[PDB]
Amino acid sequence: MRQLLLISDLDNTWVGDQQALEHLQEYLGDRRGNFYLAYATGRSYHSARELQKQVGLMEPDYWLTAVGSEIYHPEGLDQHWADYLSEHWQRDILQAIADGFEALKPQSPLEQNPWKISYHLDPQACPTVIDQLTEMLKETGIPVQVIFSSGKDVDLLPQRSNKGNATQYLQQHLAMEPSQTLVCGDSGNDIGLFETSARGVIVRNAQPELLHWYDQWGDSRHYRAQSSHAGAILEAIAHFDFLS
Numbered sequence: 141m142r143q144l145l146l147i148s149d150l151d152n153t154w155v156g157d158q159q160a161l162e163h164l165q166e167y168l169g170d171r172r173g174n175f176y177l178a179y180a181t182g183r184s185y186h187s188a189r190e191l192q193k194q195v196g197l198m199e200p201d202y203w204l205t206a207v208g209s210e211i212y213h214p215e216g217l218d219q220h221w222a223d224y225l226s227e228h229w230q231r232d233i234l235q236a237i238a239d240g241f242e243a244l245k246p247q248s249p250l251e252q253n254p255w256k257i258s259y260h261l262d263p264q265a266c267p268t269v270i271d272q273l274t275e276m277l278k279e280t281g282i283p284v285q286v287i288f289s290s291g292k293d294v295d296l297l298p299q300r301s302n303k304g305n306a307t308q309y310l311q312q313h314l315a316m317e318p319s320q321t322l323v324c325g326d327s328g329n330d331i332g333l334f335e336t337s338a339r340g341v342i343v344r345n346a347q348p349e350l351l352h353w354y355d356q357w358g359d360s361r362h363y364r365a366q367s368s369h370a371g372a373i374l375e376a377i378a379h380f381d382f383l384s
């Protein structure tokens with residue numbers, strides 16, 4: 141029932157330029173009732189909350205955490221989404237395979253969750269190994285997807301997660317149209333967002349994988365911002381003429 145569904149990543153997107161973050165929130169703070177806000181971050185919910193206290197993030201309506209593996213409503217964790225992602229998902233088997241790759245090191249336990257298996261790619265290893273991993277995982281028949289970002293982070297998720305799939309789910313939940321949605325991102329774990337039909341903005345300080353993605357799949361609905369961090373979000377809002 142609002143005119144805009146604003147979905148943004150936190151680190152290096154909404155966060156990173158304190159001054160821009162502040163004037164973005166100042167502006168949005170004057171029309172809080174005109175948009176729904178969702179933070180689609182790679183961070184776990186707890187980590188997202190700690191970041192909010194650190195930089196003073198304005199309260200969102202929804203939290204799409206751990207790359208969309210967990211959704212939090214004002215009332216709490218979405219159990220329907222959890223059950224939906226659990227269907228056909230076989231975490232143990234995928235982890236056994238990923239654990240077998242010498243170039244991969246598990247990320248700390250707190251970065252893991254039932255629908256998220258994450259690793260760090262050896263900076264000395266050949267990035268081509270991610271393609272081999274992806275092929276090997278896909279051939280298990282288990283609905284899985286591999287998210288590679290910043291040239292070092294690897295996340296194993298159900299094919300039904302993404303920041304993009306979590307976003308389409310939220311859109312349907314709120315009865316918001318893609319034309320009324322703006323996704324904001326900076327890296328490989330944001331590609332799912334740009335795969336949706338929502339309007340999107342790629343921050344100036346975006347990672348290589350995202351820019352390369354844009355070069356190949358970028359379309360009319362995708363905006364390459366001149367500003368970096370939160371400034372890119374204000375820029376996009378004006379560009380797509382949202383919150384008229």
Ligand SMILES: OC[C@H]1O[C@@](CO)(O[C@H]2O[C@H](CO)[C@@H](O)[C@H](O)[C@H]2O)[C@@H](O)[C@@H]1O
Pocket residue numbers: 150151152181182183184207247251258259287289290293294295329
């Ligand atoms: O957003 C980039 C920045 O976030 C961190 C915070 O720890 O990593 C998060 O996003 C990664 C990509 O999805 C996940 O693999 C990781 O588990 C999650 O914490 C930084 O590592 C990263 O540079």
Ligand SMILES: [Mg+2]
Pocket residue numbers: 149150151152153326327
């Ligand atoms: Mg980021």
Ligand SMILES: [Mg+2]
Pocket residue numbers: 149151182325326327328329330
């Ligand atoms: Mg990102």
